[PDB]
């Protein structure tokens, strides 16, 4: 599923990401835009053999099991394929664990490089929340 901008904002708000660990909703929408172009089916292979999955491009090196990342962890206790669903619950629940682990949203390279320090409120302008 390819989300619309306001559609995804509303789904993320319903799942409790607005101001989660101090990150306003626009941060999460911005990160999803540049990680996956709002596409739940996005996958991207990393040079170390791990793979990033879903709308927030969550990495199999630490966070999910895809059966082909030897020596990796599964800290969200899910198959990585669950992160490609049209229902974003699994991705949001896992993202809450990631952002709590100490480095905040710096865990997402695209957020650090393209959202951090910008006017992220612009990503939820016009949306009915």
DSSP 16: T
Side-chain-side CA neighbours of 80 within 13 Å: the count stands at 27
Out of 7, 48, 52, 87, the active site residue is 52
Clarify whether 35 is annotated catalytic.
Answer: yes
Question: Binding site for substrate, residues?
Answer: 101
Chain center to CA of 84: 11
Out of 18, 35, 48, 119, the active site residue is 35
Clarify whether 18 is annotated catalytic.
Answer: no
- Return d(Cα 52, Cα 80) in angstroms, integer: 9
Question: Binding site, residues?
Answer: 101
Active site positions, annotated: 35, 52
């Amino acid at each position: 599923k390819v989300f619309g901008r306001c559609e995804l904002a509303a789904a993320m708000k319903r799942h409790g990401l607005d101001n989660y660990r101090g990150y306003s909703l626009g941060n999460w929408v911005c990160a999803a835009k540049f990680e996956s172009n709002f596409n739940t089916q996005a996958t991207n292979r990393n040079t170390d053999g791990s793979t990033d999955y879903g709308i927030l491009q969550i990495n199999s090196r630490w966070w999910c099991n895809d059966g082909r990342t030897p020596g990796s962890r599964n800290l969200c206790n899910i198959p990585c394929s669950a992160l490609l669903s049209s229902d974003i619950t699994a991705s949001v629940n896992c993202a809450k664990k990631i952002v709590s682990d100490g480095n905040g949203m710096n865990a997402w390279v695209a957020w650090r490089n393209r959202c951090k320090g910008t006017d992220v409120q612009a990503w939820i302008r016009g949306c009915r929340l």
